[PDB]
UniProtKB/Swiss-Prot annotation:
<comment type="subunit">
    <text>Tetramer of two alpha and two beta chains. Interacts with FACT subunit SUPT16H. Interacts with ATF7IP. Interacts with SND1. Part of TBP-based Pol II pre-initiation complex (PIC), in which Pol II core assembles with general transcription factors and other specific initiation factors including GTF2E1, GTF2E2, GTF2F1, GTF2F2, TCEA1, ERCC2, ERCC3, GTF2H2, GTF2H3, GTF2H4, GTF2H5, GTF2A1, GTF2A2, GTF2B and TBP; this large multi-subunit PIC complex mediates DNA unwinding and targets Pol II core to the transcription start site where the first phosphodiester bond forms.</text>
</comment>
<protein>
    <recommendedName>
        <fullName>Transcription initiation factor IIE subunit beta</fullName>
    </recommendedName>
</protein>
<feature type="modified residue" description="N6-acetyllysine">
    <location>
        <position position="9"/>
    </location>
</feature>
<comment type="similarity">
    <text>Belongs to the TFIIE beta subunit family.</text>
</comment>
<comment type="function">
    <text>Recruits TFIIH to the initiation complex and stimulates the RNA polymerase II C-terminal domain kinase and DNA-dependent ATPase activities of TFIIH. Both TFIIH and TFIIE are required for promoter clearance by RNA polymerase.</text>
</comment>
<feature type="DNA-binding region" description="TFIIE beta">
    <location>
        <begin position="1"/>
        <end position="81"/>
    </location>
</feature>
Length: 81
């Protein structure tokens, strides 16, 4: 839906994946807690439903994410080689 394409879930997740990637690309490949990610992505408000979704679905089944010590890291595709 148009009202969904804006960023009702996908936009938020896309910005998170992008941020995590770029950060992991720079050097900070280390894991980050949920809230730590929200801050930089500017999604601290987000919504309990959205945060929950990210915590159990997105940052759990997304191939570009790696769950470590409860926190969430970025999973490299195949290494830049």
């Amino acid at each position: 839906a148009l009202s969904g394409s804006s960023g009702y879930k996908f936009g938020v997740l896309a910005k998170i994946v992008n941020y995590m990637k770029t950060r992991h690309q720079r050097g900070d490949t280390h894991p980050l807690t949920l809230d730590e990610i929200l801050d930089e992505t500017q999604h601290l408000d987000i919504g309990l439903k959205q945060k929950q979704w990210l915590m159990t679905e997105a940052l759990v089944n997304n191939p570009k994410i790696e769950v470590i010590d409860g926190k969430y890291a970025f999973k490299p595709k195949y290494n830049v080689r």
